Amino acid sequence: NAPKRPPSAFFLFCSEYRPKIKGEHPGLSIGDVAKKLGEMWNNTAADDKQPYEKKAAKLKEKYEKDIAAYRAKGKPDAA
């Protein structure tokens, strides 16, 4: 259950250059790769997020209606 949470905007961009920050800094954890990006993302322009952002949203949105449905009786899954 739980459609889960798709990309957050920061997922698209993260992927794009994760093996690249990992290549320069093969000493990051899910707390450093996250902290680094948590910054980069925050400083990716903002007007560079928008493209990735709109998608992360599109998906989050899907979830939001599938979660709203799940927690609001989304168990008889169109049977």
From Swiss-Prot:
Positions carrying Cysteine sulfonic acid (-SO3H): 14
Modification after translation: Phosphorylated at serine residues. Phosphorylation in both NLS regions is required for cytoplasmic translocation followed by secretion.
Modification Phosphoserine occurs at: 8
Top-level lineage group: Eukaryota
Locations listed in the record: Nucleus; Chromosome; Cytoplasm; Secreted
DNA-binding region positions on the chain: 3-71
In-chain residues carrying the UniProt-annotated modification N6-acetyllysine: 35-36, 49
Region of interest called Cytokine-stimulating activity, as start-end residue ranges on this chain: 1-16
Region annotation Binding to AGER/RAGE: where it falls in the sequence: 58-79
Family that this chain belongs to: Belongs to the HMGB family.
Subunit structure: Interacts (fully reduced HMGB1) with CXCL12; probably in a 1:2 ratio involving two molecules of CXCL12, each interacting with one HMG box of HMGB1; inhibited by glycyrrhizin. Associates with the TLR4:LY96 receptor complex. Component of the RAG complex composed of core components RAG1 and RAG2, and associated component HMGB1 or HMGB2. Interacts (in cytoplasm upon starvation) with BECN1; inhibits the interaction of BECN1 and BCL2 leading to promotion of autophagy. Interacts with KPNA1; involved in nuclear import. Interacts with SREBF1, TLR2, TLR4, TLR9, PTPRZ1, APEX1, FEN1, POLB, TERT.
Function: Multifunctional redox sensitive protein with various roles in different cellular compartments. In the nucleus is one of the major chromatin-associated non-histone proteins and acts as a DNA chaperone involved in replication, transcription, chromatin remodeling, V(D)J recombination, DNA repair and genome stability. Proposed to be an universal biosensor for nucleic acids. Promotes host inflammatory response to sterile and infectious signals and is involved in the coordination and integration of innate and adaptive immune responses. Nuclear functions are attributed to fully reduced HGMB1. Associates with chromatin and binds DNA with a preference to non-canonical DNA structures such as single-stranded DNA, DNA-containing cruciforms or bent structures, supercoiled DNA and ZDNA. Can bent DNA and enhance DNA flexibility by looping thus providing a mechanism to promote activities on various gene promoters by enhancing transcription factor binding and/or bringing distant regulatory sequences into close proximity.
Entry's free-text remark on domains: HMG box 2 mediates pro-inflammatory cytokine-stimulating activity and binding to TLR4. However, not involved in mediating immunogenic activity in the context of apoptosis-induced immune tolerance. The acidic C-terminal domain forms a flexible structure which can reversibly interact intramolecularily with the HMG boxes and modulate binding to DNA and other proteins.
Protein's name according to its UniProt entry: High mobility group protein B1
Lineage: Eukaryota, Metazoa, Chordata, Craniata, Vertebrata
Residues of the full protein shown: 58 to 136 of 180
